[PDB]
Design a protein that fits this description.
part of a larger assembly; 3 chains; A mainly alpha; B mainly alpha; C mainly beta; B: 57% helix; C: mainly beta; Methylamine Dehydrogenase, Chain H
């Protein structure tokens, strides 16, 4: 249910209002999924997961060609249903620039 | 809508509707002939598929969908299929068909089990109403199909045998592996993924055969604990039959894949199952592979 | 201000109240009992505002409104201010009611027209609904609502029979419930409860049950029949709130949140409150 409230009603504010200078809010996003279940991760992450692969590639610097591709192909779909939801759409553009 | 535009006729037969239009062969009479043809059809020497096909009678979707809508092949410029087929087939707008199919099956107006099939043919997740009730085996089956379809599509895409024309709805072109599938499968179905026969099912596909032989020996060491001596090895007696037998086969095959020591401890466990019973005739055949 | 308040409902947090008027405006108000702070106005319909309704929180706070235009123009606060997020029009002939379904039933949008037709769609932000319609009554549907609660199908496959039940009320004196079927074309009609000699007006199911489901079917024959479903799945039997013709022209008849306290809005501007008496019949609490 809580997946639906950040992706279908108000895009993350830790990827829109986050300061790009030091990215302090962006890594709060990352760390609070380390406080949310990882014992049962691949049953509730499909909007949240896109966020996860994004964050590991950029924050922690996991630049692999395969990792890059996996995110891009997935992110085309993802862009294709929330490029018309409010806020979420503006956040996708940030992600792409990064 | 022929029967009444506002207030007209009330009969359902052609000539009591419009007299312009003749009675066709329909109802029960169609059904009798249907049966007649079906009897002939269960003669081939392949009466197991021929029978399945034969019942998908009447509507075109039942039988026609199964006859295939296929990917382009032309055996005139291709020599390698010119002894396998003698004529050109397969629609060249196959990819385009696949995307249209996807959009239909997710919408209702047809039976739920029908919907899960159509979606599954094109490389997509079945309809929600069925997907919720699938077990481990059914869930697994779906996700392996996806890996095959994504990789094939990637190699063909580069030689430009599949274009933008075919795209009505995108599919991804991401890389996947089985290891990732099992983590999807296990997080949806926790009790079933630990189910004994199903553990071994996963392990062959990744080829994690040597490792799994060793892991079992470690468990046997743990067995001197009380929690362990009580349970987690008396809970699946038939799975220890399988592991010892597999262990022999891998060590004949190459006794450095996994240890002789690891094979030898496992035998000690198979021997305990002989001990429960009271057999001692069979021990020397096992003793040669210790 | 308004000289006439036709009908007026509240949200699901009880901070907002939406007034259906007749000057074509939906005035969103803030509920503070008799006094209200008018925060918004939404004029944009044809003729009297018949009905508005507020969405169950888990599919917005969406406000679907019908007038005599025969269309539901849905409004939604996008940016903290009202705008139009949707439009509907598969049945036009005056949309009388306009309801949102219970949480478990989904974001279903109940349309009920006076052409003897009834739509049942789904609210999407990605678009797409499949157009499923079922015919209720024939002389029109003057009110519609939503069936009590979703049921359980057991076995290996849940949500089979019954499930989302739609209750309607036409002008041909007929009140009945449905049973969403997936194996017999259109929604297989249950039982026609003819006990009315004048057009059906308002229908409400009791969100409070014991061992029987109450269904207050109001009519312009100046009585309210209370349909007691025996064991909740039995037949519907005749139980009379009053046996006689009230000298009041009854309109709405809506139950409380808890309890079988029913309010019936009499034509003399007096809202009697009925409780069930010492027997199976009803007597007024006020």
């Amino acid at each position: 249910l809580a997946e639906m409230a950040i992706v279908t009603s108000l895009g993350p504010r830790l990827l829109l209002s986050n300061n790009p200078v030091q990215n302090n809010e962006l890594k709060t996003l990352r760390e609070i999924l380390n406080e949310f279940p990882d014992s049962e991760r691949d049953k509730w992450s499909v909007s949240i997961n896109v966020f996860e692969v994004y964050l590991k590639l950029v924050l922690d610097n996991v630049e692999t060609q395969e990792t890059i591709d996996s995110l891009i192909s997935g992110m085309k779909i993802f862009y294709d249903q929330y490029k018309h939801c409010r806020e979420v759409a503006a956040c996708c553009n940030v992600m792409s620039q990064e | 809508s022929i029967t009444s535009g506002g207030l007209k006729s009330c009969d359902l037969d052609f000539p009591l509707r419009e007299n312009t239009n003749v009675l066709d062969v329909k109802d029960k009479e169609e059904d009798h002939i249907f049966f007649k043809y079906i009897y002939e059809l269960i003669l081939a020497g392949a009466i197991d598929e021929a029978l399945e096909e034969a019942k998908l009678s009447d509507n075109i979707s039942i039988c026609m969908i199964l006859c295939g809508i296929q990917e382009y092949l032309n055996p005139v410029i291709d020599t390698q299929i010119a002894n396998e087929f003698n004529t050109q087939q397969g629609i060249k707008k196959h990819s385009l068909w696949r995307r249209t199919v996807y959009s239909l099956s997710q919408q209702a107006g047809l039976d739920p089990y029908e919907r899960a099939i159509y979606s599954y043919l094109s490389g997509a997740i079945p309809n929600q109403e069925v997907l919720q009730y699938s077990d481990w085996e059914s869930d697994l089956h779906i996700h392996l199909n996806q890996i095959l379809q994504t990789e094939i599509e990637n190699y063909l895409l580069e030689n430009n045998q599949v274009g933008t024309d075919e795209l009505i709805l995108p599919l991804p072109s991401h890389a996947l592996t089985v290891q990732e599938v099992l983590n999807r499968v296990a997080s949806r179905h926790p009790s079933e993924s630990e189910h004994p026969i199903r553990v071994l099912m996963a392990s062959v596909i990744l080829d994690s055969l040597p490792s799994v032989i060793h892991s079992s020996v470690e468990m046997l060491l743990d067995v001197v604990k009380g929690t362990e001596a009580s349970n987690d090895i008396i809970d699946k007696p038939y799975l220890l039959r399988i592991v010892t037998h597999l262990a022999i086969c891998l060590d004949i095959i190459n006794p450095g894949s996994v240890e002789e020591v690891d094979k030898s401890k496992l035998i000690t466990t198979y021997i305990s199952l002989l001990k429960l019973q009271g057999l001692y005739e069979n021990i020397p055949i096992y003793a040669t592979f210790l | 201000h308004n000289e006439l308040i036709h009908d007026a409902v509240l949200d699901y947090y009880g901070k907002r109240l939406a007034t259906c008027s007749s000057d074509k405006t939906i005035k969103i108000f803030e509920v503070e009992g008799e006094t209200h702070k008018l925060i918004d106005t939404l004029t944009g319909h044809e003729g009297p505002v018949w009905r508005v309704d507020w969405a169950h929180p888990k599919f917005g706070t969406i406000l679907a409104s019908c007038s005599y235009d025969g269309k539901v123009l849905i409004w939604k606060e996008e940016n903290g201010r009202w705008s139009q997020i949707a439009v509907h029009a598969v049945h036009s002939a005056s949309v009388n009611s306009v309801q949102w379904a219970p949480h478990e039933y989904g974001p279903l949008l109940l349309v009920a027209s006076s052409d003897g037709k009834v739509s049942v769609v789904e609210f999407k932000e990605n678009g797409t609904t499949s157009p499923i319609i079922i015919d209720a009554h024939a002389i029109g549907v003057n009110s519609a609502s939503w069936a009590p609660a979703t049921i359980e199908e057991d076995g290996e496959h849940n949500g089979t029979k019954e499930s989302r039940k739609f209750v309607t009320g036409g002008a041909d004196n007929l009140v009945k419930i449905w049973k969403y079927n997936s194996d017999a074309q259109t929604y297989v009609l249950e039982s026609t409860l003819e006990g009315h000699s004048d057009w059906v007006r308002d229908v409400a199911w009791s969100p409070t049950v014991l061992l029987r489901s109450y269904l207050a079917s109001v009519s312009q024959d100046r009585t309210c029949i209370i349909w007691t479903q025996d064991n909740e799945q039995g037949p519907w039997k005749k139980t009379l709130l009053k046996e006689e013709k009230f000298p009041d022209v009854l309109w709405r008849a809506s139950w409380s949140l808890s309890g079988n306290v029913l309010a019936l809005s009499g034509g003399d501007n007096k809202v009697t409150l009925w409780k069930e008496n010492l027997e199976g019949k009803w007597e007024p609490a006020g």
